[PDB]
Amino acid sequence: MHTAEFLETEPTEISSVLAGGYNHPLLRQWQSERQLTKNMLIFPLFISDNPDDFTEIDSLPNINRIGVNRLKDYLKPLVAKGLRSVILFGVPLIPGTKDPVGTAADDPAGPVIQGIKFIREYFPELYIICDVCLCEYTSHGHCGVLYDDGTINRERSVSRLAAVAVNYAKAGAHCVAPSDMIDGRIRDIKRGLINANLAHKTFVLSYAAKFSGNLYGPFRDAACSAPSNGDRKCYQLPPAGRGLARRALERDMSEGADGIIVKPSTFYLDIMRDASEICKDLPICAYHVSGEYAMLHAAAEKGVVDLKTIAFESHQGFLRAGARLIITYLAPEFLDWLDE
Amino acid sequence: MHTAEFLETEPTEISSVLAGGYNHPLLRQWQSERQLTKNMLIFPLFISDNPDDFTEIDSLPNINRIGVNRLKDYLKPLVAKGLRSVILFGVPLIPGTKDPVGTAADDPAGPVIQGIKFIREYFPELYIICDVCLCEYTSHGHCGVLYDDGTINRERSVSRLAAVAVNYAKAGAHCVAPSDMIDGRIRDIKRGLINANLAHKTFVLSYAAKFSGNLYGPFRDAACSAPSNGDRKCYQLPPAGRGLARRALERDMSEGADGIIVKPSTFYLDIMRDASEICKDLPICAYHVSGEYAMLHAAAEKGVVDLKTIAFESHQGFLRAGARLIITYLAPEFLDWLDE
Amino acid sequence: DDGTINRERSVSRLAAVAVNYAKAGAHCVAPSDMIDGRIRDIKRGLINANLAHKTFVLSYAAKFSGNLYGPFRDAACSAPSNGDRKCYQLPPAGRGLARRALERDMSEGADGIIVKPSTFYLDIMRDASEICKDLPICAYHVSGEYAMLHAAAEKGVVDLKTIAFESHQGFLRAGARLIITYLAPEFLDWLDE
Amino acid sequence: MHTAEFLETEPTEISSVLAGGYNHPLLRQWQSERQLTKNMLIFPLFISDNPDDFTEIDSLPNINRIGVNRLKDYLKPLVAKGLRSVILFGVPLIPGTKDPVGTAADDPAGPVIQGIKFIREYFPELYIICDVCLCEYTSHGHCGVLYDDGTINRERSVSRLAAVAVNYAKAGAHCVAPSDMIDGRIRDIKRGLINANLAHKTFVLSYAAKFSGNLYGPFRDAACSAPSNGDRKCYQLPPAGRGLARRALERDMSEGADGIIVKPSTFYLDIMRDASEICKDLPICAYHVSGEYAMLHAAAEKGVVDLKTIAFESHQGFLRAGARLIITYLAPEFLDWLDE
Ligand SMILES: *C(CO)CCC(=O)O
Ligand SMILES: *C(CO)CCC(=O)O
Ligand SMILES: *C(CO)CCC(=O)O
Ligand SMILES: *C(CO)CCC(=O)O
Ligand SMILES: [Zn+2]
Ligand SMILES: [Zn+2]
Ligand SMILES: [Zn+2]
């Protein structure tokens, strides 16, 4: 008859015993290199050129396109809940606004600058971060000024991007986040800020590690940034490009970045780990993109996982990988959860 | 009139130029530290104690519970497609089979050992990996022998696990993968193998970094391993426990592991990166758990992402993070995709 | 018989005490003896008592001899009898010894370590953060440091809440992620604002 | 009856035995990476524009504001005791002396330059260090030239600071210690020195790691440097800013610093440890600020600790953390103590 067999074991080696460090709920916290707090969250904002706007984004569950006239009633509760920072994204819908050089990018009458002025007056305690790019302002939809052939023109592009970033800062933005990925843009942006005498008050949060992938979905709807002819795989790092990512991190830091952003996040946790060593002295921010965010909601709906649970697992994964800041659409939720 | 502003730029710094390394499709490959190949895939197999079995797992799309009599027709096409390895999971459904010491675990008449003998004869070229645990064979459902209170009994547990692993090897398994997570089990398993004169032919692939989370869903259905009273957070590493994970990796390696497994995968990519340094001389395997696998399918169904695309992004993320082996339910698909 | 500690009997006794505390229901034991090799014996005792998997071992790996243990001598009534405690307690300048003790205790089974004093030994916390990078590090704001802040605050040399925050956040900066302090009640209030 | 229990112990492991290295008083010295000597001390001097001055500073016990006419009788005993270096701080009390550009900073008739000339003639063997800043010479009280809004103007500020440092060197100072903390001031000061052909005889001791805190008390009295509107938290490193401190250390070194100062000291011992690695090839100096100094006296008075004892513990803590130089108000005392 088959009976349970027990092998002859040796005395337990102390070096084998790790269980004593995580047998209690409190220990789970002690074991964390970093704990999740409210001031670590950065809520994205999609400002429309229509003051009374407040449309719901398709691919972006619970996220809408707001106009200045609705901001106040939208931010009030969040700020009271502990929100400390926001990242502005402009969405000009007015016809004839876009062009080949993203002129509307720093339009003082545009959504971005209008939102900055609005927030600075009604919420002088909120930290204002502005994404810096021309994708949402170009006729083509790309992140920069294209040559005649279609490929980006670094020189003119960065020249333009630097102006935009400086103008946002001039408008009152505390921080600029260039999501273009164009070679050397950080240096020119830093120089522009220095020349505008704003380098000492403007934090430069560079999207140092921005990979091309299948998770930018929803954002394409909310921001309306559909590339025109060709792939964005010209500037956006290849998913397997770890070496390039490491070099971009070092480059951006050396070019003046005060902090860096890794995007996507969950699917690029190893990259956050790399940035934590290379950019050990700088704050690292994780960007939970629309695609990852929508992916969690989808799986939760199909009962594959619990939203709050998986939301916590993923976010605390960012902190584990080395991030100390998080740009997420789940901010409103966390502002509640972190209370319990 | 608001007009496009262009800042005065300096000459481009060579150190800024990285674009020259990934402007072509072929370059995307050259930029990869490791390329995805067929022999890197490990398909999981859920063997039932019913020879004619072939039930579809709920929470596990396209995955079923097979009986020995259906294996052959199921493996034939996969093997012809390039499959080189499998990881066996036993699913005894016969009543009165489970007990307090997982006696049925190494039952020569059980699904696991029956599957090994079957595969070794019909597919002598397939690499046979066997998960090693007692969760699916205990009355309680836990991964080991519990004390009277309910908490695991390391001594008896590891003593039992070592016997099971050795018996699988004796049956003919090429590799054993202890997924228990009980402190010091690797040492006892290695010693048992050495004493059984099988240490030189048995690869020990330890689940060194196994985290507790919300992604083990589907498996609970396929394997029928529902914990009885309490949480598995007693042995399974806490999601934020990076320090513990690093110590477990070092421990298992020092205890005789020939390779290590990181599970989950995607949500723990930073941990794979850590293992790649600590266990730089050992092969690292990523385990795309049921929850992650189901999460991709769910998101794909909701049109949030494309299955093939995101499947490739996630898998190539494993390789980027340092893994050179992958246990995934998407193996059948990749065996097709890798052809194009 | 001479007066100097007897490691063998001492550690033998300490291990029993720690195990009994655990048997009583304590989640964690913190050996503040500083006697060579006590962590190993305590871990072994716990293993033999089948409590090693539920008992966290928080060792005072870096305990220095100094002029800041004042107040505690009153509260605990632990006045040494003949001689100095400088026999086991690390010398204030002993960085090398502190580093070796940290490594030793970790290798002996410590699940976490305590650095005491704290403020006056911030560099040691920094060392422990590298050596014991995978373990939680705890700072112990001793009675002397605690009383020193109150004294200076009373003399209007500094503001209690302010300096309390500066010192504590100094512990975190130096690498600690846990803090044993008498200012806890206060922080439980302050951290609310 | 409760009786003493003794567990069964194993043979002592040699690796456990460390006691053999510090069982004797002499061993306490052998165990020190660096021993405290007289030539390691740097006594601060507050020179007033009143030659017969000699007022006692409130918040600074045993420290006074001296005029040139009292220096000689004040330094004579200290120098005979072994004093080898001093750090000069100017305290112009004459009305209409301060202005928006700290003009009086390098006034040849000012206290600082007057003190240098005095010391160079009566004590040609003393090493003269001069703090470099404009806080004590500006109408506002800040460490530099402010813009119209109130925030520092780096360009003009550093431009001014470089002139001041060079003029001190021209006057005869052996070393300059810029305590401004303004970005890039070290580079301009080094360049000015090079252009003045004094770079080979002037040691640049930068306050690389100067944190904002609650320990600058007493100095505000002795130096009379009360900020006007706003916080000094604009240039002074945030108490938790380790990353910034590490970057400032590297920056200053690369900019020409021959040595660096960490201030405060005791409360920033971990920072001294960081500097010891980053600036391993440069001498590191600890600054026992007024607040820490007064804190020891206060605690000693309340019988919380013994002055001599705690003075020794704290100072030898600086050496342990990596410093090999110490700027302290307890110098006079140590010049006595180090004799026994
Ligand atoms: C990145 C654009 O800067 C954000 C994409 C998203 O989906 O959040
Ligand atoms: C882990 C059990 O050993 C596998 C879980 C899964 O869902 O694949
Ligand atoms: C250390 C005794 O274990 C504590 C001393 C104190 O004053 O807190
Ligand atoms: C720093 C000014 O440079 C000295 C402050 C003190 O209190 O010593
Ligand atoms: Zn863009
Ligand atoms: Zn199991
Ligand atoms: Zn100043």
Q: Measure Cα distances from A310 to A40, A314, A339, B24, D266 in Å.
A: 18, 6, 18, 37, 43
Residue B292, CB-side half-sphere exposure with 13 Å CA sphere: 25
> For chain B, how big is the Rg over CA atoms in Å?
22
DSSP-derived secondary structure for C17-54: HHHHHHHHT-SEE------TTHHHHHHHHHHHTT-TTT
* A194: closest CA of chain B, how far (Å): 12
Active site annotation includes A76: no
DSSP H or E run through B159: helix B154-171
Interface probe for D, chosen from C34, C67, C72, C167 (most Cβ of D below 10 Å), is: C67
- Residue C69 CB less than 6 A away from ligand 3: yes
Rounded Cα distance between C124 and D80, Å, is 36
**Nearby residues of D314 by Cβ (< 8 Å), 6 or more positions away:** C120, D265, D266, D288, D292, D296
Rounded Cα–Cα distance for residues A202 and A165 (Å): 10
List residues forming the annotated binding site of D for Zn(2+).
Answer: 133, 135, 143
H, E, C per residue of C66-135: CCCCHHHHHHCCCCCCCCCCCCCCECCCCHHHHHHHHHHHHHCCCCEEEEECCHHHHHHHHHHHHHCCCC
Find, among C139, C97, C136, C143, the residue nearest to C116 by Cα.
C139
- Of chain B residues 206-245, which have a CB less than 8 A from chain C? 234, 242-244
Nearest CA to C91 among D231, B212, A268, D22?
D22
**Nearest partner of B265 among B242, B283, B291, judged by Cα:** B291
Question: Quick one: which of A282, A240, A265, A278 has its CA closest to A320?
Answer: A265
Longest dimension (CA), chain D: 86
CB burial of residue D51 (10 Å; 0-12, 13-18, 19+): middle
Neighbours of ion ligand 7 (CB under 5 A): D 133, 135, 143
Domain boundaries, chain D: 1-340
Contacts of C46 in chain A (CB under 8 A): 20
Which ligand 4 atom sits nearest the alpha carbon of residue D290? Answer: 7
> Taking chain A, what is the end-to-end CA distance rounded to the nearest angstrom?
54
- Measured between CB atoms, which of C40, C53, C112 is closest to A14? C40
Cα distances (Å, whole numbers) of residue A187 to A158, A182, A191, B10, D246: 9, 11, 6, 9, 22
Residue with tokens 């900020």: D227
Q: Which strands form C56-63's sheet, in the order they lie side by side?
A: C28-29, C56-63, C112-116, C137-140, C178-180
**Of residues A7, A188, A213, nearest to B192 (C-beta):** A7
Q: How far apart are CA A207 and CA A254, in angstroms?
A: 14
Peptide bond before residue A264 is cis, with ω within 30 degrees of 0: yes
CA D21 to centroid of chain Cα atoms = 34
Q: Do chains D and B touch (3 or more CB pairs under 8 A)?
A: no
Q: Which two tokens stand for residue D73?
A: 């009788």
Rounded Cα distance, C124 and B334, in Å: 52
A24: tokens are 């209690």
The set of chains that have 3 or more CB pairs under 8 A with D is A, C
Spatial separation of the C-alpha atoms in residues A219 and A327, rounded to whole Å: 14
- With tokens 């006007």, the residue in question is D228
Ranges of H-type helices in B24-122 = 25-30, 68-80, 111-122
Tell me: cis bond preceding D264? Omega within 30 of 0 counts.
yes
Active-site residue list of C: 63, 116
Tokens of B169: 């090897």
DSSP string, D213-246: SS--HHHHHHT-----SS-STTTSBPTT-HHHHH
Taking the CA of residue A288 as reference, the ligand 1 atom at the shortest distance is 8
Question: Residue A149: how many CB atoms within 10 A of its CB?
Answer: 6
Choose among B2, B99, B156: nearest Cβ to A108.
B2
Q: Which of D256, D277, D276, D272 is nearest to D327 (CA)?
A: D272
* CB-CB contact of B58 with B101 (8 Å): no
Question: Is B206 strand, coil or helix?
Answer: strand
Scored b (16 or more CB within 10 A) or e, C98-112 reads bbbbbebbbebbbbb
Catalytic annotation, pick one of A76, A117, A170, A210: A210
Structural contact between residues B260 and B279, judged by C-beta atoms closer than 8 angstroms: yes
CA neighbor of C66 nearest in space, from C116, C107, C30, C22: C116
Helix (H, G, I), strand (E, B) or coil at D287: strand
Which of A194, A195, A281 would best serve as a mutation to test chain D binding (most D beta carbons within 10 A)?
A: A281
Tokens linked to A327: 């740009």
> Quick one: CA dihedral D132, D137, D141, D142, positive or negative?
negative
Residue D270's region, left for phi above 0, alpha for psi from -120 to 50, else beta, is: alpha
The answer to whether the beta carbons of residues D184 and A199 sit under 8 Å apart is no
Q: Which segments of chain A does DSSP mark as H helices, in order?
A: 25-30, 68-80, 111-122, 154-171, 185-195, 217-222, 242-254, 269-278, 290-301, 307-320, 331-337
From CA A193, how far away is CA A199, in angstroms rounded?
5
CB B84 within 8 A of CB B38: yes
Q: Are D164 and D102 in contact (CB under 8 A)?
A: yes
- Interatomic CA distance for residues D145 and B193, integer angstroms: 76
**Element of type H or E holding B192:** helix B185-195
Residue D216 CA to its chain's centroid (Å): 12
Q: Which residue's C-alpha comes closest to atom 3 of ligand 2?
A: B179
Per the annotation, binding residues of C for 5-aminolevulinate are 73, 85, 143, 182
With contact defined as beta carbons under 8 Å apart, do B266 and A267 qualify? yes
Which ligand approaches the C-alpha of residue D140 most closely?
7
Strands C56-63 and C28-29: parallel
Host H or E run for residue A225: none
The answer to whether B162 and B189 have CB atoms below 8 angstroms apart is: yes
- Among B233, B283, B231, which Cα is nearest to B258's? B283
Report d(CA A321, CA A288) in Å as an integer: 14
Separation between Cα atoms, residue D78 and residue B125, nearest integer Å: 88
Those residues whose C-beta lies under 8 Å from the C-beta of residue B239, and which sit 6 or more positions away, are: A313, A316, A317, A320, B211, B212, B213
Give me D162's structure tokens.
């470089």
Please work out, in degrees rounded to the nearest 5, the angle formed at the alpha carbon of residue B45 by the alpha carbons of B41 and B51: 150
Residues 190-209 of A with CB under 8 A from D: 197, 200-201
Q: Give the span between the Cα atoms of D272 and D279, in whole angstroms.
A: 10
Distance (Å, whole) CA B173 – CA B149: 35
Q: Which of A44, A40, A223, A255 is nearest to A129 (CA)?
A: A44
Taken in order A150, A155, A156, A159, the sign of the CA dihedral is: positive
Please state, in angstroms and rounded to a whole number, the distance separating the CA atoms of residues B49 and B110: 6
A305 contacts B217? CB cut-off 8 A? yes
**Residue D136, SS3?**
helix
Q: How far is CA B76 from CA B81, B122, B123, B331, D219, in A?
A: 9, 9, 9, 14, 84
d(CA A66, CA A112): 11
Residue type, C141: H
CA distance C93 to chain B (A): 29
**N residues, chain C:** 193
Answer for the pair D62, D20: CB distance below 8 angstroms, yes or no: no
Paired residues of C58 in beta bridges: C112
Query: Three-class SS of residue A147?
Result: coil
Give the Å distance between the CA of A25 and the centre of ligand 2.
Answer: 24
Ranges assigned E (strand) in B39-178: 41-48, 54-56, 64-66, 85-91, 127-132, 175-178
Omega cis (within 30) before B264 = yes
D1-340: which CATH number, 3.20.20.70, 3.30.460.30, 1.10.10.10, 3.90.1490.10? 3.20.20.70
Strands A41-48 and D284-287: unpaired
DSSP tally for chain D: helices H, then strands E: 11, 10
Report the structure determination method.
Answer: X-ray
Is there a cis peptide before residue A218, judged by omega within 30 degrees of 0? Answer: no
For residue B39 the two structure tokens come to 């022999």
Using DSSP's 3-state secondary structure scheme, residue A152 falls into strand
Task: Dig out the tokens for B259 from the structure.
Answer: 């390779």
3-state secondary structure of D298: helix
Cβ contact, residue pair A33, C177, below 8 Å: yes
Torsion of CA B220, B224, B229, B231, to 10 degrees: -30
Of residues A214, A211, A222, A116, the one with CA closest to residue A169? A116
Instruction: Please tell me the number of Cα atoms within 13 Å of A280 on its side-chain side.
Output: 6
Contact D270, D193 (CB under 8 A): no
User: Exposed, middle or buried, A3 (CB in 10 Å: 0-12/13-18/19+)?
Assistant: exposed
Ligand 4 binding pocket includes D89 (Cβ within 6 Å): no
The C-alpha angle A172, A176, A179, rounded to 5 degrees, equals 145
CA separation for the pair B164, A7 (Å, rounded): 9
Q: Is the CB of C64 under 6 A from ligand 3?
A: no
Task: Find residue A211's DSSP bridge partners.
Answer: A237
- Cα separation, A34 vs A321, whole angstroms: 10
B180 C-alpha to center of ligand 6: Å? 5
Tokens of D77: 């005993």
First-to-last alpha carbon distance for chain D, in angstroms, is 54
CA atoms within 13 A on the CB side of C21: 15
Peptide bond into A332 cis (omega under 30): no
Q: Is the dihedral of CA B78, B79, B85, B88 positive or negative?
A: positive
Instruction: Give chain C positions within 8 Å (CB) of A27.
Output: 56
The token pair at A109 is 């009458």
- Pairing type for strands A41-48 and B284-287 reads unpaired
Contact B291 A309 (CB under 8 A): no
Paired residues of D129 in beta bridges: D87, D175
Residue C27: left if φ>0, alpha if ψ -120 to 50, beta else—which one?
alpha
Q: Is the CB of residue C182 below 6 angstroms from any atom belonging to ligand 3?
A: no
Report how far residue D119's alpha carbon sits from residue C50's, in angstroms, rounded to the nearest whole number: 73
D chain contacts of residue C131, beta-carbon cutoff 8 Å: none
C127 interaction partners in chain D (CB closer than 8 Å): 273
B241/B117 Cα distance (integer angstroms): 39
Mutate to test the interface with A, among B1, B3, B15, B16 (most CBs of A within 10 A): B16
| CA D22 to mean position of chain CA atoms | 32
CA separation for the pair A275, A189 (Å, rounded) = 21
- CA distance readout (Å), D176 to C25, D173, D263, D331: 61, 7, 16, 20
Task: Please spell the DSSP secondary structure of A237-254, one letter per residue.
Answer: BPTT-HHHHHHHHHHHHH
3-state secondary structure A24-56: CHHHHHHCCCCCCCHHHEEEEEEEECCCCCEEE
**What is the Å distance from ligand 1's center to A104 Cα?**
20
Identify the burial level of A206 via C-beta atoms within 10 angstroms of its C-beta, where 0-12 means exposed, 13-18 middle and 19 or more buried. buried
Q: Which residues of B308-317 are buried (b: 16+ CB within 10 A; e: fewer)?
A: eebbbbbbbb
Q: Where does ligand 1 bind, in terms of residues with CB under 6 Å?
A: A 131, 179, 216, 218-219, 289-290
State chain B's maximal CA–CA distance in angstroms: 86
Mutate to test the pocket of ligand 3, among C14, C34, C35, C69 (most ligand atoms within 8 A of CB): C69
CB distance from C157 to chain D under 8 Å? yes
Identity of the residue numbered D193 = L
Q: In the numeric block, which tokens belong to residue A144?
A: 């920069």
The minimum CA-CA distance between A78 and chain C, rounded to whole Å, is 17
Resolution of the determined structure in angstroms stands at 1.9
| Distance, CA of A259 to CA of B107 (rounded, Å) | 57
| Residue whose CA is at the smallest distance from ligand 2 atom 2 | B179
B319 HSE (CA, 13 A, CB side): 19
Instruction: Tell me how far apart the alpha carbons of residues B30 and B21 are, in angstroms, rounded to a whole number.
Output: 9
Is the CB of C62 inside 8 Å of chain B's CB atoms?
A: no
* Chain C neighbors (3+ CB pairs < 8 Å): A, B, D
Which of B45, B171, B53, B55 is closest to B107 using CA atoms? Answer: B171
- Ligand index nearest the alpha carbon of residue A181: 5
For residue B181, give the ligand nearest its CA. Answer: 6
Measured in Å, residue B236 CA sits from the centre of ligand 6 at 10
Min Cα distance C28 → chain A (Å) is: 9
> What CA–CA distances, in Å, run from D216 to C122, D212, D232?
20, 8, 11
Residues 23-42 of C with CB under 8 A from D: 36-37, 40-41
Q: Which atom of ligand 1 is nearest to the CA of A60?
A: 7
Helices (H), D100-153: 111-122
Rounded distance between C-alpha atoms, residue A159 and residue B7, angstroms: 5
